[PDB]
Amino acid sequence: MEDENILRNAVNLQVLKFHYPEIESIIDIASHVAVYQFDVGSQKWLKTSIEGTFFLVKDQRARVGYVILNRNSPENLYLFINHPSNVHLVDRYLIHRTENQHVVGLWMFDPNDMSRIFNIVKESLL
Amino acid sequence: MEDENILRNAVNLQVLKFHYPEIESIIDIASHVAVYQFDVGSQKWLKTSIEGTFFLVKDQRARVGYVILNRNSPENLYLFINHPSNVHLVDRYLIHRTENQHVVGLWMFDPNDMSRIFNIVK
């Protein structure tokens, strides 16, 4: 049934707007993703304690970003994507250079979600 | 005696040129300095294992820089200073923003060395 998706998205947007008022709409959703960060001093990848649902959102200022509602702690992740060259799809992972020059690695538990979300990000930044 | 200082500076320059050939002359020397680093992830200061004599040098390219001959390990420190606005003097510490935008802290064992070296860098 179609109505279920409208109510689901409505509640989702109500929650995201509760945490982030500038969010306007939800572009897409990934079920379960893990967040890694690359440490410059160690020169290696590290696993962050952030895990949960991935929301590809657009805010009032037409900016494209993603919120990850952490299932492990109240600390969510809200990052913006400003340039197509700052997001790459390598192997089964999406690596993103944030605004603060940090290197984040996103691993989707569903491989198809990775492809769909990446291509819709490409279509979002043009 | 004056000759002793000429011999000192000459040997110093031979060593610095042995590790870094592009060095041309030694502007000044500080006796004992400690090197700290600021970590962006930690948001805090950390102590590095680099300690020893501090050489304010000029290289071939007229750039001003410093080599710190580590008394603890063979890895030395060679950093360039590109802008007077990239070096700040703290009440008793010297903070320097390097070429790679790293934040380095120098602690001179002699405070007069600190003041003199900062003003000669300016």
């Binding site: 960060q37 809200y78 603060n100 | 962006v40 934040v103």
Partner: peptide
Amino acid sequence: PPSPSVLPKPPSHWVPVSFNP
């Protein structure tokens, strides 16, 4: 060899923000 705990804060515009705000 003073401990790095007594060291003051670096300058703000030179200091970079850490990962998540």
